[PDB]
Design a protein around this motif. Structure first.
Motif, PDB file in Angstrom:
ATOM      1  N   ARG A 144      14.380 157.574   1.387  1.00 37.73           N
ATOM      2  CA  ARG A 144      15.301 156.888   2.325  1.00 37.73           C
ATOM      3  C   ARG A 144      16.490 157.811   2.563  1.00 37.73           C
ATOM      4  O   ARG A 144      17.492 157.729   1.823  1.00 37.73           O
ATOM      5  CB  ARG A 144      15.711 155.509   1.816  1.00 37.73           C
TER       6      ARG A 144
ATOM      7  N   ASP B  31      18.040 161.018   5.831  1.00 33.78           N
ATOM      8  CA  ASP B  31      17.891 161.737   7.122  1.00 33.78           C
ATOM      9  C   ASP B  31      16.811 162.820   6.997  1.00 33.78           C
ATOM     10  O   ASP B  31      16.958 163.740   6.163  1.00 33.78           O
ATOM     11  CB  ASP B  31      19.242 162.291   7.512  1.00 33.78           C
TER      12      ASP B  31
ATOM     13  N   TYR C 179       9.863 159.751   5.647  1.00 38.56           N
ATOM     14  CA  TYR C 179      11.328 159.478   5.676  1.00 38.56           C
ATOM     15  C   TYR C 179      11.571 158.168   6.433  1.00 38.56           C
ATOM     16  O   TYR C 179      11.007 157.978   7.476  1.00 38.56           O
ATOM     17  CB  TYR C 179      12.084 160.659   6.291  1.00 38.56           C
TER      18      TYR C 179
ATOM     19  N   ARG D 143      14.974 154.877   6.864  1.00 40.46           N
ATOM     20  CA  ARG D 143      16.436 154.678   6.677  1.00 40.46           C
ATOM     21  C   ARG D 143      16.753 153.297   6.071  1.00 40.46           C
ATOM     22  O   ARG D 143      17.911 153.101   5.557  1.00 40.46           O
ATOM     23  CB  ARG D 143      17.167 154.891   8.003  1.00 40.46           C
TER      24      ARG D 143
END
Ligand code: CL
Ligand code: CL
Ligand code: CL
Length: 163
Positions: free
Chosen positions: A11, A13, A145, A147
């Motif tokens: 989690r 960028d 990945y 967010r």
């Protein structure tokens, strides 16, 4: 290839990844765009030279020696569920071909069509399963990945449940 090819989720960028190459959730016109695409443009702007490519395809452009694989998922605002599902599966199959061609041992990948291309639906499971269908036959270490904290838990559970 990786010694013991794995899936992981982080989690953070994707622009700060620790892998040998990155998948951009691109738009078809090679524009800076928003979300993942904008962060990728800020980090690897040289990779957007002649990056435009149709929906359901992937095009790699080198930023120095670092490969950026521009993968164009469908915008579910424009596509029917059925046609969107076909193009989303296709984009990930083209990612698997590019990762294999490049001979990388690791790749950072977002879940395609789950943000502003989702047509306002939760597509975690749909996008993740198409990611697995494509990448399972590759030997790169895949690092997904995201967010959102609850997306990280759900991705982690889906990975561990196959192990
Ligand atoms: Cl971050
Ligand atoms: Cl998206
Ligand atoms: Cl997310």
């Amino acid at each position: 290839g990786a010694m013991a090819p794995s899936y992981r989720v982080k989690r953070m960028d994707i622009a700060k990844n620790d892998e040998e190459c990155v998948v951009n959730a691109a738009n078809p016109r090679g524009l800076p765009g928003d979300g993942v695409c904008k962060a990728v443009y800020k980090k690897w702007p040289e990779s957007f030279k002649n990056s435009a490519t149709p929906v359901g395809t992937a095009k790699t452009v080198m930023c120095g020696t670092y490969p950026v694989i521009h993968a164009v998922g469908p915008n579910f605002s424009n596509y029917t569920e059925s046609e969107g599902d076909r193009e989303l599966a296709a984009a990930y199959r083209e990612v698997a071909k590019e990762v294999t061609r490049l001979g990388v041992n690791s790749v950072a990948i977002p879940l395609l069509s789950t943000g502003v291309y989702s047509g306002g639906k939760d597509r975690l499971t749909q996008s993740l399963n198409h990611l697995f269908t494509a990448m399972d036959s590759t030997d790169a270490d895949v690092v997904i990945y995201c967010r959102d904290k609850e997306w990280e838990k759900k991705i982690s559970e889906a990975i561990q449940m196959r192990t």
